[PDB]
Design a protein around this ligand. Structure first.
Ligand SMILES: C=CC1=C(C)/C(=C/c2[nH]c(/C=C3N=C(/C=C4\NC(=O)C(C)=C4C=C)C(C)=C\3CCC(=O)O)c(CCC(=O)O)c2C)NC1=O
Length: 240
């Protein structure tokens, strides 16, 4: 992240989360993943503020697509988006997070390990490791929208109330990533029917994430409807 244009000007929580994700991935058997049009940096404006986005994306044998995206709208909204899309053959859940901030602080902090099984449960080993973290206390919980049925029972969706809660959230993301990267070492290739089940779950996850009109409006205000539809369906939440 040393070379990032956006990092020095992002919200401090976002900065720490970007660092923690990058550190998680740094020593993995990474290969490039080329986004559409080999996208890296992009900016756009229409009648209002400009939107700037920086994209990084990788893959490993266990992770189809590892996407870390940083964005800023003018000087007033920052975003961090990250999804680790699993290779269905290994049946791992989806790591994701979305952190939205403005000059007044973080408004939204979401993180999850989301299921891909048809029973909508995480694998047993994840259930047990996540439970062992304890129920975190957060003073300003937010209720997921209906499309957020995709998220696990461990999903976080808060407005951090103070620095202690910002740090607690970051630590929980670090703990999610640690669990995930360990479970990826012990995963074995699954049967064809199980692989297919997991593929289905990933497709459903992406179709539901595309219902987030808050994200879509940010994109539309800077680039228009057609660009935003392409970005959400081809860059952010591609349907395999
Ligand atoms: C250019 C990219 C990008 C932008 C600009 C972005 C913006 C964005 N995401 C939001 C919410 C949200 N975002 C999520 C969740 C997620 N979203 C994800 O991209 C992932 C991976 C998850 C979860 C793992 C949820 C659940 C909400 C709340 C939606 C709502 O309030 O209706 C909001 C509303 C913040 C608030 O209400 O305080 C904005 C503006 N998200 C982005 O990804």
């Amino acid at each position: 992240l040393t070379n990032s244009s956006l990092m020095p000007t992002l919200n401090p929580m976002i900065q720490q989360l970007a660092l923690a994700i990058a550190a998680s991935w740094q020593s993995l058997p990474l290969k490039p993943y080329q986004l559409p049009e080999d996208l890296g940096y992009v900016e756009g404006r229409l009648e209002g503020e400009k939107l700037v986005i920086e994209n990084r994306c990788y893959q490993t044998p266990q992770f189809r697509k590892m996407h870390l995206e940083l964005a800023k709208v003018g000087k007033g909204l920052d975003d961090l988006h990250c999804v680790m899309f699993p290779e269905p053959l290994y049946g791992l859940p989806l790591f994701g997070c979305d952190i939205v901030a403005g000059p007044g602080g973080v408004s939204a902090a979401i993180a999850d390990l989301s299921p891909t099984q048809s029973d909508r449960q995480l694998p047993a080993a994840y259930q047990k490791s996540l439970a062992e973290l304890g129920q975190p206390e957060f003073e300003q919980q937010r209720e997921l929208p209906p499309w957020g049925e995709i998220f696990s029972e461990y999903c976080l969706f808060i407005r951090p109330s103070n620095v202690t809660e910002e740090e607690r959230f970051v630590q929980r993301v670090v703990d999610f990533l640690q669990i995930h990267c360990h479970q990826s070492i012990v995963a074995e290739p699954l049967s064809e029917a199980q692989t297919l089940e997991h593929r289905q779950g990933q497709i459903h996850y992406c179709q539901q994430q595309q219902k987030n009109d808050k994200t879509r409006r940010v994109l539309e205000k800077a680039f228009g409807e057609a660009w935003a539809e392409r970005y959400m369906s081809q860059v952010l939440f591609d349907v395999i």
